[PDB]
Symmetry: D2
Subunit: 183 residues, 4 copies
């Protein structure tokens, strides 16, 4: 008995609210386990590298992040090196907080599963750390730079009701079927 899930699209107010914290008594519980399993499953089906609970319609501070080596390798080596893209294992964070460690800004195109079909360049900090709980309830601080830091920031912004269209260079917004190419 399979089921349907959908990623909410811009216009749904759940993407602009401030997600609520998960309560201690829910940690390690069945309901949070179903939510984390669904987030990871959607994230992986869509081949995206992060997803947050509000995008599945659940206004709670939960997000998952993963970048498999196959996806880094899909990126041409020069572009991979420019973006400082390196793989990293799946991590799920509950009630996370972000601390900026290197505030230099780096700008590259990104897109969001909740604004399907578009990209724009967005400046992001070079390095950050995210601290929060696992769904079992243990604390972890994960520090990263480059593309991983960009993913952490994009996903953290979703828990504050922020989407990348709020931070983009709007003259670079584009449907994914238009692209710049080498002559």
């Amino acid at each position: 008995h399979m089921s349907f899930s959908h990623v909410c699209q811009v216009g749904d107010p759940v993407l602009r609210g401030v997600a609520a914290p998960v309560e201690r008594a829910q940690l390690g519980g069945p309901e949070l386990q179903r939510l984390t399993q669904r987030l990871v499953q959607v994230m992986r089906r869509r081949r995206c590298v992060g997803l947050s609970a509000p995008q599945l319609g659940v206004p709670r501070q939960v997000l998952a992040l993963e970048l498999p080596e196959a996806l880094c390798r899909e990126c041409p080596p020069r572009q991979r090196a420019l973006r400082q893209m390196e793989p990293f294992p799946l991590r799920v964070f509950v009630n996370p907080s972000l601390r900026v460690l290197d505030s230099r800004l780096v700008t590259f195109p990104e897109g969001c599963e909740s604004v399907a079909g578009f990209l724009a360049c967005v400046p992001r900090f070079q390095a950050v750390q995210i601290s929060g709980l696992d769904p079992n309830g243990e604390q972890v601080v994960w520090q990263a730079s480059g593309w991983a830091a960009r993913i952490i920031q994009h996903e953290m912004d979703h828990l504050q009701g922020c989407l990348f269209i709020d931070k983009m260079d709007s003259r670079t917004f584009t449907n994914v079927y238009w692209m710049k190419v080498n002559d």
Copy 2:
């Protein structure tokens, strides 16, 4: 005798360039007449109230504006009065320039045929003057306020390579299939 026309979508660089003037050699000529006729035809087919030549792929300073009574009438009356939405006849402007007459800002939702399917709230000046040539080279000046002034501003921005997403309140950006309703 039928052909296809298309409204360019965001990503096409024609929408971000600064449109070149129409050379005087072209005024009153067949090529300019085919372009103005096509802009008016597509504007009326799409039931929209302004269109510019870069949106049909032509990087030239030409735009058309029209608000038929039936479109105003489709607006509920209290919204129509708040927006100061009143009908006006077709005008076509070639090499137009804009001056602000009343710089008070008014915010309402707008959409654009070149960012199909979305709306966002955009501040606009209350009143403006657009001056330019009709397709035959005669001077035309139109001072407008309220919703007519907002239409003029949106079309004139297209000839500078500016889309409403560059000026919007991005937290109000929405797919048109999401909307606020009265309970």
Copy 3:
């Protein structure tokens, strides 16, 4: 007060289910009244001529139809005549059934708010009868031809889990930003 509503998009399984009937006990009731008020409000905000409860996420046999004169005059006279498009007052039907009175097929482009942004040609019967209850349980039978018969058939198909892409000439499917025009 203010709330959000959305029209479900294709992929949502609610659009492919067969809506359940409203039980006799519910006719004239406050829950049905909430649904019918919401359906008509969304229909009027989107300026669409018909809407069904599955498109608001509610798998119940309830639809609304309305074609105001202004909306109707937005179509040029020659096209309204070809399409037999005439205004008609609001009807809300509960548990409707359809009978075909004239099975001649008529084909014109149609779109659906649950497949936002596309049109395609769809053959429809020239005249039908819809019979059902008004939200109060009164029996209402409406015989319609031409464009109103097409709206009726499109909304009734929603209650059976059928969308217009199931019945279209697929070689005429188009984004709305492409159109055939007269030279």
Copy 4:
């Protein structure tokens, strides 16, 4: 130096035409080289596994196909095995013809870069041979089964003016942001 390329979307009549053959005089030439390099670049940028000239607005019988290992490994092993998905190198075909080698039908979801953002299940033959010329005019033949045969048939359809929506199971058409998941 850089320019912009776009994948034409449904509605553009170039996608429904039957593409003209490449004339013998053009084989090996610079214009055909520019077209093939552009196809391969867009195909690689978009991480898709085939692309045809009509989709870059050029109504000529040219297509390219490529499934790199990394892109292949984005798909989980169980799903790869089910779909008979394996990597294969770049091939570019000019004036190709298709012969069916195993007419057994296999049904899975596919999407098209010219119908951005949707998928639907389409039955396809289990094995085919494509034969045609390379850009230098040498005979190229490739016998393929499973997922590779699907991609061949999808690209060949584009040179006949056929899109997947003409062959799909329409009840399975879905926005990519709706998906079936495991409980």
